[PDB]
Write a protein that binds this ligand. Structure first.
Ligand SMILES: COc1ccccc1-n1c(-c2cc(O)ccc2C)cn2c3c(=O)[nH]c(=O)n(C)c3nc12
Length: 287
């Protein structure tokens, strides 16, 4: 990590004030705080003393990756505390939290145009990651953060730590740990994770957004989801969903990876719909 960490600012512990717990885990927490530079609010992820070598490499490795990105729709790294304990990753603060919880608590409070604007931001962040040769593997509303301008930013970076740390990722019969109902068939079936499997996941995120955080496939078990997808079934249209948006998410769920749009296509399509907003007035039939 010592090369990628050169892109990161080492922050002295005195400059950081932790204030409120906003997330928790086994070996650390997530805080809202302030960062001395005037003071800016920040989000802070910690790693407490007792961590293993692998945990340190994974934890600092996320910062090394995040520090190589500069994009409006990608969470911005402020710096790290790595010389002292607890270790910390310090990012910009997203006032409205995770997108999935945000939408479930704000059910029906946004216009279609605002929801589609969210999706455009997510797709722009994903296009950037893909062209930077970064495959996310865990794209889902729970990993998108929302600020007070309603800007959505992709978070949760790293190598093995991404799917290890997510409790939605479960062990398959063949030994991989994956979040089944967000994951493309080829990634489940033979561990083929690419920007095109991220597009499948993006289609699920489109459904999460337009449903205000409905849980994909409802109470179907993971095996029943895999069986339904293999047999050709797809998630049904959300309520009050523009036909163009439903058509786009259905294209993200093509079984054949080569038939899915690229993120460049997704951004282009969403930008044209937004700039001609009457295109969103035509709604797909809700059952
Ligand atoms: C989905 O966001 C997280 C997931 C797990 C742990 C922390 C956060 N996480 C991050 C984050 C994300 C990273 O990938 C790396 C470092 C950090 C600090 C920022 N925020 C925020 C945030 O800025 N505002 C929030 O309300 N919440 C709930 C947050 N949760 C996180």
């Amino acid at each position: 990590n010592q090369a990628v960490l050169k892109f990161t600012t080492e922050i002295h512990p005195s400059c950081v004030t932790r204030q409120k717990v906003i997330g928790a885990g086994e070996f650390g927490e997530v805080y809202k705080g302030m960062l001395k530079t005037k003071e800016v609010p920040v989000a802070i992820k910690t790693l407490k003393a007792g961590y293993t070598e692998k945990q340190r490499v994974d934890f600092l490795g996320e910062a090394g990756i995040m520090g190589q990105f500069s994009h409006h729709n990608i969470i911005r790294l402020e710096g790290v505390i790595s010389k002292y304990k607890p270790m910390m990753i310090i990012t910009e603060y997203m006032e409205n939290g995770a997108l999935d919880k945000f939408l479930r608590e704000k059910d029906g409070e946004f216009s279609v145009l605002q929801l589609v604007g969210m999706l455009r931001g997510i797709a722009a962040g994903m296009k950037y990651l893909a062209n930077m040769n970064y495959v996310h593997r865990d794209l889902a509303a729970r990993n998108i953060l929302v600020n007070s301008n309603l800007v959505c930013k992709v978070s949760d970076f790293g190598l093995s730590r991404v799917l290890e740390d997510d409790p939605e990722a479960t062990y398959t019969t063949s030994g991989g740990k994956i979040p089944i109902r967000w994951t493309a068939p080829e990634a489940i079936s033979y561990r083929k994770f690419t920007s095109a499997s991220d597009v499948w996941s993006f289609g699920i995120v489109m459904w999460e957004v337009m449903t205000y955080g409905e849980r994909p496939y409802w109470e179907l078990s993971n095996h029943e989801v895999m069986k339904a997808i293999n047999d050709g079934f797809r998630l049904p249209t959300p309520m009050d969903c523009p036909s163009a948006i439903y058509q786009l998410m259905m294209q993200c769920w093509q079984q054949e990876r080569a038939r899915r749009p690229k993120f460049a296509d997704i951004v282009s399509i969403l930008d044209k719909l937004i700039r001609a907003p009457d295109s969103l007035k035509t709604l797909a039939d809700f059952d």
